[PDB]
């Protein structure tokens, strides 16, 4: 039973905050590995996932990668990269060791650049993947005029910059573009003054409470307004200076949140024989005391992407692995071409890549009285939107007008 070694890179230590992603996804990884092994899908071989802790740090992450090459077995590919600056360093160097990388949690749009990161793939949609979903939401409700409110931090300005290209050649005007660093009120007053009704917000959880306080003060809420903001904030994020909690909630009422879909809502059997719901129960049992992670399905599908890639790679060599050292350009190219062919129905929906980027599912939510409720989903492969019939609501007789 020869091994097919894989270099697992992720923060794993309790001392590191993003160690919760790496630990939260491992039961999902264990489940996928265990199944593939039982079924002897990679017969005669077996999947050998070796784990190395990056500690979510550039220097330690790089040393973990280097040590893995020096003292570890001959890895055929890299699985992981969670923290954006660590993943960028490893991803950029990949061709030096002919290593294809598959990430399940690095969402930074920067990684889509195939001139800089040609050997990098990811099962998770990037922070920019919400922009094609928002366009469909705007088209659905006949919102042709929008305003933008963006925090002056790279994570958010990347997203706003991508929105420009997504809305070009579409019948949607960005009538007002406003930026802020610490206080959004000046920009919120400018939006009000320019009579903006539909606002596309890109800012962190801390700034969101400030944005909605300014919205209450400027009366930028209710039947005439629609705020479309990030959907990745922690639950009860608002509860955690001039506004009252009741006034913040009144301004928050009806906001649409947008983020990737953690798992498929389709009750259909996936590549493993299990429905996403059956997988979710198996994951929740296996995790025990370890806190769940929203990337677990992306990590589970990631293992299946690797096993299916290795299968295609084994077929390509048989149509004409042990001898592969980081020296073999041809095998890295075979693996690279094999991964580009990925096309199966996973727990996160249909797993397909478009230039190393995941074509996946975007979830829409709406803040309704006390919490965010799912109101719809965007399928990036089909470029289609499905709104949940009797969930999404408006304070007026019709959804708001854009002017």
């Amino acid at each position: 039973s020869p091994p097919l070694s894989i270099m697992g890179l992720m923060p794993l230590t309790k001392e590191v905050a993003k160690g919760s992603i790496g630990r939260g996804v491992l039961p999902a990884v264990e489940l996928a590995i265990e199944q593939i092994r039982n079924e002897s899908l990679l017969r005669p071989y077996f999947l050998d996932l070796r784990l190395y802790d990056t500690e979510c740090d550039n220097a330690k992450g790089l040393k973990a990668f280097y040590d893995a090459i020096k003292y570890g077995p001959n890895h055929l590919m890299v699985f992981g990269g969670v923290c954006p600056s660590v993943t960028s360093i490893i991803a950029e160097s990949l061709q030096g060791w002919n290593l294809v990388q598959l990430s399940f949690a690095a969402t930074t749009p920067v990684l889509a650049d195939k001139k800089k990161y040609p050997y990098f793939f990811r099962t998770v949609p990037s922070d920019n993947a919400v922009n094609p979903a928002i366009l469909k939401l705007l088209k659905h409700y006949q919102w042709k005029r929008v305003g933008t409110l963006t925090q002056d931090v790279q994570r958010f300005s990347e997203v706003r910059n991508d929105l420009t290209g997504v809305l070009y050649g579409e019948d949607i005007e960005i009538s007002d573009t406003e930026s802020f660093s610490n206080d959004p009120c000046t920009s919120v007053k400018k939006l009000k003054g320019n009579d903006v009704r539909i606002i596309l917000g890109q800012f962190d959880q801390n700034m969101a409470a400030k944005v909605f306080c300014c919205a209450y003060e400027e009366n930028m809420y209710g039947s005439k307004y629609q705020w479309i903001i990030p959907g990745w904030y922690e639950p009860s994020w608002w509860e955690q200076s001039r506004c009252l909690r009741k006034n913040l909630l009144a301004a928050m009422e009806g906001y649409i949140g947008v983020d990737f879909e953690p798992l498929s809502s389709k009750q259909i059997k996936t590549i493993s024989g299990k429905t996403p719901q059956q997988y979710e129960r198996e994951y929740n049992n296996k995790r025990s005391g370890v806190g769940p992670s929203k990337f677990h399905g992306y990590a589970y599908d990631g293992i299946w992407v690797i096993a299916k890639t290795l299968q295609r790679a084994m077929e390509t060599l048989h149509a004409s692995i042990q001898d592969f050292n980081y020296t073999d350009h041809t095998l890295g190219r075979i693996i690279l071409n094999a991964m580009n062919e990925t096309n199966f129905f996973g727990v996160t929906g249909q797993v397909v890549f478009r230039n190393g980027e995941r074509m996946g599912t975007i979830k829409f939510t709406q803040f309704q009285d006390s919490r965010e409720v799912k109101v719809g989903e965007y399928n990036a492969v089909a470029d289609t939107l499905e709104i949940i019939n009797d969930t999404i609501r408006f304070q007026g007789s019709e959804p708001p007008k854009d002017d």
Binding site: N58, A59, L62, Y66, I89, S93, G96
Partner: protein, 407 residues
């Protein structure tokens, strides 16, 4: 009886954004021969070089950093060139307790001791232009300054430093404008706000676009002074660009009278340095070692800094004198070379070599003015000693420089 070999792991950019390794690798090789032949420097040791071509690329440099660290012999120092390469190797270095000495990195971000705790550079930070800028404002009595920048990290960091330095001198930044590739709007906005003293930070391609836009809006003349970087090619405005509407004569008109700041990299004086060479002998010796002409050789002007980097290291190693026992798991030797490197003070081919608290090079700046489509040397400034070398060669319309506002 036996001289022990001690090794430098260097990275040279032979191609890419700044192909500085073309002249810096032979400058380094020349300095190693000069240091090794001197018995009063490191008599018990022989400084040797192990090097790779980074191609001014961090991805490419990641492969060679591994090759340097995971292969015998153990290296005692790392020597990268490009800022993007130094940012990668200088942050990674603490995991191997290695000093990093760059001969070509200008990035202001490399002056952060938290991210880069063992970093030094014989090339100054791009922020070295700022004390010369504040001193020029003080000389011509200006307290209101406008700033236009291309959207790049270096220019953003340089302006951030210019903000804290003007505040110290009782000078304020009136308006700050930025552009990614196309100016026009910031240039239009500069005429709009009636800005007179303008600091413009951009690369040469963007400078042409800026000054073509400066022409149309008539932002040149007696009313305004432009402060630019001095390392563009000779006759950069005269250079043909299909994306510029303005002509050679139009651009020549828009650029007249602008001031530039640039780092002095070769001592203008005819004095002899620690190697016992003059600036002119270094240049002559380096030209002989080159396959191509100095003009066709990348990093020719920075070559004295690479030569001086080797001497700074040799002198530091000389001050410490147990070099063979260096290991990546131990800090003891590193801390001693850090201390010796920090206390560097000597005369190199690039002039007096000293680092600030951040490990960044302190040097003279050359101040120039574009008089009749050509640059004339109007002065030099020494930030550490507050010493301004003034030559009465500066010229302005109406026999005097204008003012910052309405008057």
């Amino acid at each position: 009886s036996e001289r022990r070999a001690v090794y430098i792991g260097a990275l040279f950019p032979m191609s890419g954004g700044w192909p500085g390794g073309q002249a810096c690798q032979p400058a380094v090789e020349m300095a190693l021969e000069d240091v090794n032949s001197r018995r009063d420097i490191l008599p018990d040791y022989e400084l040797k070089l192990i090097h790779h071509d980074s191609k001014c690329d961090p991805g490419q440099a990641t492969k060679y950093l591994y090759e340097l660290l995971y292969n015998d012999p153990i290296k005692i120092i790392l020597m990268p060139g490009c800022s993007s390469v130094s940012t990668l190797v200088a942050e990674a270095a603490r995991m191997w307790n290695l000093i990093v000495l760059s001969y070509g990195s200008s990035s202001p971000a490399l002056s952060n001791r938290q991210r880069f705790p063992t970093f030094f550079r014989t090339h100054p930070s791009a922020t070295l232009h700022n004390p010369t800028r504040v001193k020029l404002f003080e000389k011509w009595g200006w307290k209101k300054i406008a700033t236009i920048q291309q959207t790049t990290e270096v220019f953003t960091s340089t302006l951030d430093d210019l903000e804290e330095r003007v505040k110290e001198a009782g000078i304020e930044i009136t308006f700050r404008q930025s552009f990614f590739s196309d100016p026009a709007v910031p240039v239009k906005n500069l005429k709009r706000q009636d800005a007179r003293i303008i600091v413009g930070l951009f690369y040469e391609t963007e400078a042409r676009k800026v000054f073509c836009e400066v022409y149309k809006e008539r932002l040149f003349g007696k009313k305004y002074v432009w402060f630019l970087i001095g390392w563009y090619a000779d006759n950069w405005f005269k250079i043909y660009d299909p994306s510029i509407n303005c002509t050679v004569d139009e651009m020549t008109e828009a650029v007249e009278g602008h001031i530039t700041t640039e780092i002095v990299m070769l001592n203008p004086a005819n004095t002899r340095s620690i190697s016992n060479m003059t600036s002119q002998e270094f240049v002559e010796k380096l030209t002989k070692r080159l396959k191509r002409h100095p003009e066709e050789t990348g990093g020719f002007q920075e070559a004295p800094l690479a030569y001086d980097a080797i001497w700074a290291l040799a002198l530091a190693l000389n001050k410490t004198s147990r070099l063979e026992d260096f290991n990546y798991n131990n800090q003891t030797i590193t801390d001693q070379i850090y201390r010796a490197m920090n206390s560097s003070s000597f005369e190199g081919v690039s002039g007096h070599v000293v680092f600030d608290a951040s490990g960044s090079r302190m040097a003279w700046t050359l101040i120039e003015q574009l008089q009749g489509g050509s640059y004339k040397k109007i002065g030099y400034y020494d930030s550490t000693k507050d010493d301004l070398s003034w030559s009465k060669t500066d010229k302005w319309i109406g026999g005097s420089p204008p003012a910052d506002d309405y008057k």
